[PDB]
Amino acid sequence: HMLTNLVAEPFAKLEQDFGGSIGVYAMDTGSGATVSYRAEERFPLCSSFKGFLAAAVLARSQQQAGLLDTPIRYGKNALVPWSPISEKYLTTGMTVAELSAAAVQYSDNAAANLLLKELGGPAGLTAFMRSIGDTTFRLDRWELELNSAIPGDARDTSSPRAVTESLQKLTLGSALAAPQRQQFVDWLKGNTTGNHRIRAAVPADWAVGDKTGTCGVYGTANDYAVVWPTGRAPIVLAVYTRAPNKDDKHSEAVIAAAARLALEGLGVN
Numbered sequence: 001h002m003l004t005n006l007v008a009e010p011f012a013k014l015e016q017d018f019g020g021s022i023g024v025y026a027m028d029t030g031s032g033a034t035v036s037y038r039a040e041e042r043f044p045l046c047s048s049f050k051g052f053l054a055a056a057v058l059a060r061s062q063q064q065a066g067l068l069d070t071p072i073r074y075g076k077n078a079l080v081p082w083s084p085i086s087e088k089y090l091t092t093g094m095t096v097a098e099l100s101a102a103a104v105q106y107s108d109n110a111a112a113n114l115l116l117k118e119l120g121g122p123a124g125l126t127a128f129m130r131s132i133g134d135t136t137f138r139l140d141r142w143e144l145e146l147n148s149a150i151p152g153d154a155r156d157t158s159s160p161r162a163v164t165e166s167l168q169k170l171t172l173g174s175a176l177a178a179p180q181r182q183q184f185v186d187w188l189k190g191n192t193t194g195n196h197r198i199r200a201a202v203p204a205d206w207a208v209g210d211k212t213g214t215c216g217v218y219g220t221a222n223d224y225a226v227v228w229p230t231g232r233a234p235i236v237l238a239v240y241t242r243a244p245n246k247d248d249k250h251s252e253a254v255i256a257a258a259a260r261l262a263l264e265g266l267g268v269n
Ligand SMILES: O=c1cc(CP(=O)(O)O)c2ccc(Br)cc2n1/C=C\Cc1ccccc1
Pocket: 046, 047, 048, 081, 082, 106, 107, 109, 143, 144, 147, 193, 212, 213, 214, 215, 216
Protein backbone atom coordinates (compact mmCIF):
# COMPACT_ATOMS: atom_id res chain seq x y z
CA HIS A 1 0.00 0.00 0.00
CA MET A 2 2.71 2.47 -1.24
CA LEU A 3 0.57 3.80 -4.15
CA THR A 4 2.98 6.64 -5.17
CA ASN A 5 3.93 4.88 -8.49
CA LEU A 6 0.25 5.28 -9.58
CA VAL A 7 1.03 9.12 -9.50
CA ALA A 8 4.91 9.54 -9.29
CA GLU A 9 5.16 10.54 -13.04
CA PRO A 10 2.25 13.04 -12.82
CA PHE A 11 3.85 14.65 -9.69
CA ALA A 12 7.17 15.11 -11.61
CA LYS A 13 5.28 16.76 -14.52
CA LEU A 14 3.31 19.09 -12.12
CA GLU A 15 6.51 20.22 -10.33
CA GLN A 16 8.31 20.62 -13.74
CA ASP A 17 5.42 22.89 -14.96
CA PHE A 18 5.48 24.72 -11.56
CA GLY A 19 9.28 25.28 -11.82
CA GLY A 20 9.98 24.38 -8.19
CA SER A 21 9.70 21.50 -5.69
CA ILE A 22 6.39 19.93 -4.51
CA GLY A 23 6.26 17.83 -1.30
CA VAL A 24 3.22 15.66 -0.53
CA TYR A 25 2.39 13.07 2.12
CA ALA A 26 -1.16 11.67 2.18
CA MET A 27 -2.36 8.93 4.57
CA ASP A 28 -5.59 6.87 4.22
CA THR A 29 -6.33 6.41 7.98
CA GLY A 30 -8.48 3.31 7.12
CA SER A 31 -5.98 1.04 5.26
CA GLY A 32 -2.81 3.03 6.22
CA ALA A 33 -2.11 3.31 2.41
CA THR A 34 0.10 6.34 1.66
CA VAL A 35 1.24 8.63 -1.19
CA SER A 36 4.76 10.17 -0.82
CA TYR A 37 6.49 12.67 -3.11
CA ARG A 38 9.49 14.53 -1.59
CA ALA A 39 7.70 13.67 1.74
CA GLU A 40 10.94 13.75 3.83
CA GLU A 41 12.41 17.05 2.41
CA ARG A 42 12.22 20.22 4.62
CA PHE A 43 9.84 22.97 3.42
CA PRO A 44 9.25 26.36 5.09
CA LEU A 45 6.16 26.20 7.41
CA CYS A 46 5.11 29.88 6.74
CA SER A 47 1.69 30.39 8.50
CA SER A 48 1.10 26.58 8.71
CA PHE A 49 2.74 26.49 12.23
CA LYS A 50 -0.35 28.41 13.53
CA GLY A 51 -2.50 25.20 13.45
CA PHE A 52 0.08 23.40 15.62
CA LEU A 53 0.28 26.59 17.81
CA ALA A 54 -3.52 26.37 18.39
CA ALA A 55 -3.18 22.60 19.19
CA ALA A 56 -0.35 23.38 21.73
CA VAL A 57 -2.64 25.99 23.44
CA LEU A 58 -5.49 23.37 23.57
CA ALA A 59 -2.92 20.89 25.07
CA ARG A 60 -1.96 23.40 27.82
CA SER A 61 -5.73 24.08 28.51
CA GLN A 62 -6.07 20.38 29.56
CA GLN A 63 -3.72 21.14 32.52
CA GLN A 64 -4.30 24.90 33.17
CA ALA A 65 -7.76 25.96 34.50
CA GLY A 66 -9.30 28.87 32.50
CA LEU A 67 -6.47 29.34 29.93
CA LEU A 68 -8.86 29.59 26.90
CA ASP A 69 -11.03 32.39 28.55
CA THR A 70 -8.05 34.64 29.61
CA PRO A 71 -8.48 38.13 28.04
CA ILE A 72 -5.28 39.28 26.24
CA ARG A 73 -4.70 43.03 25.64
CA TYR A 74 -2.14 44.27 23.10
CA GLY A 75 -0.75 47.58 21.75
CA LYS A 76 -0.69 49.02 18.22
CA ASN A 77 2.95 47.74 17.99
CA ALA A 78 1.72 44.04 18.02
CA LEU A 79 -0.26 44.67 14.77
CA VAL A 80 2.19 43.27 12.16
CA PRO A 81 0.87 42.90 8.59
CA TRP A 82 -1.98 40.35 7.93
CA SER A 83 -3.68 40.73 11.34
CA PRO A 84 -7.26 41.02 9.99
CA ILE A 85 -9.07 39.94 13.25
CA SER A 86 -6.76 41.39 15.97
CA GLU A 87 -6.75 44.87 14.22
CA LYS A 88 -10.60 44.97 14.82
CA TYR A 89 -10.15 44.29 18.64
CA LEU A 90 -7.04 46.46 19.27
CA THR A 91 -9.09 48.80 21.56
CA THR A 92 -10.72 45.84 23.46
CA GLY A 93 -8.36 42.80 23.51
CA MET A 94 -9.39 39.17 22.72
CA THR A 95 -9.49 35.85 24.68
CA VAL A 96 -6.79 33.12 24.21
CA ALA A 97 -9.52 31.03 22.42
CA GLU A 98 -10.35 33.94 20.05
CA LEU A 99 -6.62 34.54 19.27
CA SER A 100 -6.34 30.74 18.60
CA ALA A 101 -9.42 30.82 16.32
CA ALA A 102 -8.05 33.95 14.53
CA ALA A 103 -4.57 32.32 14.07
CA VAL A 104 -6.14 29.16 12.56
CA GLN A 105 -9.11 30.59 10.59
CA TYR A 106 -7.66 33.98 9.38
CA SER A 107 -3.87 33.21 9.73
CA ASP A 108 -3.77 36.29 12.06
CA ASN A 109 -0.04 37.20 12.58
CA ALA A 110 -0.48 39.37 15.73
CA ALA A 111 -2.65 36.60 17.28
CA ALA A 112 0.07 34.02 16.40
CA ASN A 113 2.90 36.13 18.04
CA LEU A 114 0.73 36.70 21.18
CA LEU A 115 0.03 32.91 21.55
CA LEU A 116 3.73 32.07 20.87
CA LYS A 117 4.62 34.40 23.81
CA GLU A 118 2.13 32.45 26.06
CA LEU A 119 4.02 29.15 25.13
CA GLY A 120 7.55 30.61 25.67
CA GLY A 121 8.21 31.36 21.98
CA PRO A 122 9.26 29.18 19.00
CA ALA A 123 11.21 26.76 21.31
CA GLY A 124 8.04 26.24 23.39
CA LEU A 125 5.95 25.26 20.30
CA THR A 126 8.92 23.04 19.16
CA ALA A 127 8.89 21.40 22.68
CA PHE A 128 5.10 20.64 22.32
CA MET A 129 5.76 18.98 18.88
CA ARG A 130 8.64 16.91 20.42
CA SER A 131 6.15 15.80 23.17
CA ILE A 132 3.77 14.19 20.58
CA GLY A 133 6.71 12.31 18.93
CA ASP A 134 7.49 14.88 16.12
CA THR A 135 11.36 15.08 15.83
CA THR A 136 11.33 17.00 12.44
CA PHE A 137 9.28 20.16 13.20
CA ARG A 138 11.26 23.25 14.15
CA LEU A 139 10.07 26.80 14.74
CA ASP A 140 12.99 29.24 15.20
CA ARG A 141 11.55 32.78 14.73
CA TRP A 142 8.35 34.94 15.08
CA GLU A 143 6.05 36.55 12.41
CA LEU A 144 7.07 37.94 9.94
CA GLU A 145 10.84 36.95 10.08
CA LEU A 146 9.97 33.16 9.95
CA ASN A 147 8.79 33.77 6.29
CA SER A 148 12.34 34.29 4.79
CA ALA A 149 12.13 30.75 3.16
CA ILE A 150 15.89 30.78 2.40
CA PRO A 151 17.00 27.83 0.20
CA GLY A 152 18.69 25.14 2.34
CA ASP A 153 17.73 26.95 5.63
CA ALA A 154 16.21 24.39 8.09
CA ARG A 155 14.90 27.23 10.37
CA ASP A 156 11.04 27.28 10.59
CA THR A 157 10.64 24.05 8.52
CA SER A 158 9.17 20.56 8.69
CA SER A 159 8.56 17.73 6.20
CA PRO A 160 5.19 16.93 4.60
CA ARG A 161 5.33 13.48 6.31
CA ALA A 162 6.03 14.91 9.81
CA VAL A 163 3.27 17.52 9.30
CA THR A 164 0.73 14.78 8.24
CA GLU A 165 1.87 12.42 11.10
CA SER A 166 1.45 15.23 13.72
CA LEU A 167 -1.87 16.44 12.19
CA GLN A 168 -3.26 12.83 12.40
CA LYS A 169 -2.14 12.46 16.08
CA LEU A 170 -3.82 15.81 17.03
CA THR A 171 -7.10 15.56 15.00
CA LEU A 172 -7.79 11.75 14.90
CA GLY A 173 -5.33 10.17 17.42
CA SER A 174 -4.92 10.58 21.20
CA ALA A 175 -2.41 13.50 21.38
CA LEU A 176 -5.33 15.73 22.65
CA ALA A 177 -8.24 14.85 25.01
CA ALA A 178 -11.58 14.34 23.13
CA PRO A 179 -13.04 17.88 23.69
CA GLN A 180 -9.74 19.71 22.77
CA ARG A 181 -9.43 17.41 19.67
CA GLN A 182 -12.97 18.35 18.53
CA GLN A 183 -12.21 22.10 19.14
CA PHE A 184 -9.00 21.67 17.03
CA VAL A 185 -11.03 19.96 14.26
CA ASP A 186 -13.77 22.71 14.45
CA TRP A 187 -11.12 25.49 14.10
CA LEU A 188 -9.61 23.85 10.97
CA LYS A 189 -13.12 23.17 9.54
CA GLY A 190 -13.91 26.93 9.82
CA ASN A 191 -10.68 28.12 8.10
CA THR A 192 -11.33 30.94 5.51
CA THR A 193 -7.90 31.19 3.75
CA GLY A 194 -7.78 27.75 2.01
CA ASN A 195 -10.62 27.75 -0.59
CA HIS A 196 -8.12 27.67 -3.55
CA ARG A 197 -5.83 24.89 -2.11
CA ILE A 198 -6.70 21.37 -0.79
CA ARG A 199 -10.45 22.37 -0.56
CA ALA A 200 -10.42 23.07 -4.35
CA ALA A 201 -9.59 19.33 -4.89
CA VAL A 202 -12.39 18.06 -2.56
CA PRO A 203 -16.12 17.60 -3.44
CA ALA A 204 -18.68 19.92 -1.69
CA ASP A 205 -20.32 16.95 0.19
CA TRP A 206 -17.01 16.04 2.04
CA ALA A 207 -15.97 17.72 5.33
CA VAL A 208 -12.45 19.39 5.30
CA GLY A 209 -10.33 21.23 7.87
CA ASP A 210 -7.13 22.90 6.63
CA LYS A 211 -4.37 25.34 7.57
CA THR A 212 -2.58 27.41 4.84
CA GLY A 213 0.91 28.91 4.76
CA THR A 214 2.25 31.54 2.29
CA CYS A 215 5.80 32.92 2.79
CA GLY A 216 5.58 35.44 -0.14
CA VAL A 217 9.08 34.55 -1.51
CA TYR A 218 10.82 31.55 -3.17
CA GLY A 219 7.46 30.28 -4.57
CA THR A 220 6.86 28.96 -1.00
CA ALA A 221 3.24 28.14 0.04
CA ASN A 222 1.43 25.15 1.54
CA ASP A 223 -1.73 23.65 3.02
CA TYR A 224 -2.49 20.65 5.26
CA ALA A 225 -5.91 19.14 5.79
CA VAL A 226 -7.88 16.29 7.28
CA VAL A 227 -10.52 15.24 4.70
CA TRP A 228 -13.61 13.16 5.64
CA PRO A 229 -14.76 11.47 2.42
CA THR A 230 -18.31 10.06 2.81
CA GLY A 231 -18.44 6.30 3.46
CA ARG A 232 -14.70 5.93 4.14
CA ALA A 233 -12.04 6.67 6.79
CA PRO A 234 -10.59 10.20 6.83
CA ILE A 235 -7.56 11.24 4.69
CA VAL A 236 -4.74 13.32 6.27
CA LEU A 237 -2.44 15.14 3.80
CA ALA A 238 0.19 17.87 3.53
CA VAL A 239 1.13 19.76 0.32
CA TYR A 240 4.23 22.05 0.53
CA THR A 241 5.96 24.00 -2.28
CA ARG A 242 9.23 25.95 -2.66
CA ALA A 243 11.16 27.32 -5.71
CA PRO A 244 14.83 28.25 -6.27
CA ASN A 245 14.51 32.07 -6.93
CA LYS A 246 13.36 34.68 -4.35
CA ASP A 247 11.15 36.25 -7.12
CA ASP A 248 9.44 32.90 -7.96
CA LYS A 249 5.67 33.07 -7.26
CA HIS A 250 3.70 30.41 -5.29
CA SER A 251 0.66 28.82 -7.07
CA GLU A 252 -2.56 27.85 -5.28
CA ALA A 253 -3.60 25.90 -8.47
CA VAL A 254 -0.43 23.73 -8.17
CA ILE A 255 -1.29 22.98 -4.48
CA ALA A 256 -4.90 21.99 -5.52
CA ALA A 257 -3.52 19.93 -8.48
CA ALA A 258 -1.07 18.17 -6.05
CA ALA A 259 -3.89 17.42 -3.54
CA ARG A 260 -5.98 16.00 -6.47
CA LEU A 261 -3.05 13.67 -7.48
CA ALA A 262 -2.63 12.50 -3.81
CA LEU A 263 -6.39 11.63 -3.53
CA GLU A 264 -6.26 9.88 -6.98
CA GLY A 265 -3.17 7.97 -5.69
CA LEU A 266 -5.13 6.82 -2.58
CA GLY A 267 -7.97 5.73 -4.97
CA VAL A 268 -10.52 8.17 -3.39
CA ASN A 269 -13.28 9.48 -5.75
O1 LIG B 1 2.20 36.16 6.96
C1 LIG B 1 1.47 35.92 5.98
C2 LIG B 1 0.09 35.27 6.06
C3 LIG B 1 -0.73 35.02 4.83
C4 LIG B 1 -2.10 34.25 4.82
P1 LIG B 1 -1.49 32.40 4.75
O2 LIG B 1 -0.06 32.25 5.16
O3 LIG B 1 -2.19 31.53 5.77
O4 LIG B 1 -1.64 31.89 3.35
C5 LIG B 1 -0.16 35.39 3.46
C6 LIG B 1 -0.94 35.16 2.31
C7 LIG B 1 -0.41 35.53 1.08
C8 LIG B 1 0.87 36.14 1.05
BR1 LIG B 1 1.75 36.65 -0.63
C9 LIG B 1 1.65 36.36 2.19
C10 LIG B 1 1.13 36.02 3.41
N1 LIG B 1 1.99 36.29 4.67
C11 LIG B 1 3.36 36.89 4.60
C12 LIG B 1 3.46 38.40 4.33
C13 LIG B 1 2.31 39.09 4.52
C14 LIG B 1 2.66 40.57 4.21
C15 LIG B 1 1.70 41.49 3.84
C16 LIG B 1 2.11 42.81 3.61
C17 LIG B 1 3.46 43.18 3.73
C18 LIG B 1 4.41 42.25 4.09
C19 LIG B 1 4.01 40.94 4.33
